[PDB]
Amino acid sequence: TLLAKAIANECQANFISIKGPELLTMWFGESEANVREIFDKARQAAPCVLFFDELDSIAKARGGNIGDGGGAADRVINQILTEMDGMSTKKNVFIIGATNRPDIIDPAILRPGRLDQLIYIPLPDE
């Protein structure tokens, strides 16, 4: 989160942080249309860096790694994917995702036009 904030600060770009509790609230309440509002806010604040901290919360909520009988697809992540695909002309908004469980993350998240650039944040050195 601090790294994303620092990258936003260097470019003097607004920073919007969507924590895991917000995604889980949209999932439990079955109100995933608010993701569209989030992206609209990002558009209004452009240039902006839309950061989705701990994006794997919904996957953990459905069972963690074993999960439910279904696949990796979920309502909130699906809305995020739709918005990200449509969020290509803006250019200003930059989407940054953070996840402590990359294994359970939806593979569609990593397809081109999505969060392609995976960066490993390892434990700090001396």
């Binding site: 390892p122 434990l123 050195d125 001396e126």
Partner: protein, 96 residues
């Protein structure tokens, strides 16, 4: 790109087999040719295929196959990094 030693050996063996079959078939026909049409002067032209050529190797490589899949190589890479020398001592320096 990723052929194992066994795969390369199989390719070489198949090329040699193709060359042997071609040589046998050719000299057999050539022998019919003398038996069917006895030539007045005997002049053997030696072997029609004395050594393995490019076409034999191309036909053999046509059947080349990768015995070792990339998933089992991935498991071996996992075990190799399962003998990982830690991740905090790489910069160990004595106090001086």
């Amino acid at each position: 790109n990723g052929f194992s030693g066994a795969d390369l050996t199989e390719i070489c063996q198949r090329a040699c087999k193709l060359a042997i079959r071609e040589s046998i078939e050719s000299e057999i026909r050539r022998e019919r040719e003398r038996q069917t049409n006895p030539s007045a002067m005997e002049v053997e032209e030696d072997d029609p295929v004395p050594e393995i050529r490019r076409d034999h190797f191309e036909e053999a490589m046509r059947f080349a196959r990768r015995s070792v899949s990339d998933n089992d190589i991935r498991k071996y890479e996992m075990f190799a990094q399962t003998l990982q020398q830690s991740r905090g001592f790489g910069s160990f320096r004595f106090p001086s």
